[PDB]
Amino acid sequence: QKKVKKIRKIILKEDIPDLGKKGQLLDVRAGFLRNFLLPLGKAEVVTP
């Protein structure tokens, strides 16, 4: 139907460009999260 921007809320475990310092809270697109951050150990998807 209408494209709905997917929003994954995450914590950064290392510092990455444009994102920020280690141990940081953010919200991201699903593609960015699962295809880039997550395989490289860089981020962690959070649902407490």
Longest dimension (CA), the chain: 37
Q: Which of residues 8-37 bind RNA (CB under 7 A)?
A: 18, 28-32, 34-36
Residue 5: name its binding partner from Mg ion, RNA, none (Cβ under 5 to 8 Å by kind).
RNA
Residue 3 binding RNA, by CB under 7 A: yes
Q: Which of residues 4-43 bind Mg ion (CB under 5 A)?
A: 4, 6
Residue 28: name its binding partner from Mg ion, RNA, none (Cβ under 5 to 8 Å by kind).
RNA
